[PDB]
């Protein structure tokens, strides 16, 4: 029941994905996950470090509040 996305927003935007290791939920749009290409296994950006555009995530989520 924990949300921790790179955008920092805690609302549910209608399409989220759960880290298989730490169980936090993230918005697929923020994480650049294509709804047509959901992976079998998913790890968040802490459990599988990688670079993402945080500012893009924030601006996308602002208009979803």
């Amino acid at each position: 029941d924990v949300t921790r996305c790179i955008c920092g927003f805690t609302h549910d935007d209608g399409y989220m994905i759960c880290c298989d290791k730490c169980s936090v939920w993230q918005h697929i749009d923020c994480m650049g996950i294509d709804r047509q290409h959901i992976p079998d296994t998913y790890l968040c950006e802490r459990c599988q470090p990688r670079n993402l555009d945080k500012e893009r995530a924030v601006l996308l989520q602002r208009r979803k509040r």
Binding site: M16, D40, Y42
Partner: peptide, 7 residues
């Protein structure tokens, strides 16, 4: 993966 699509 586990996802959720809240409507």
């Amino acid at each position: 993966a586990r996802t959720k699509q809240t409507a």
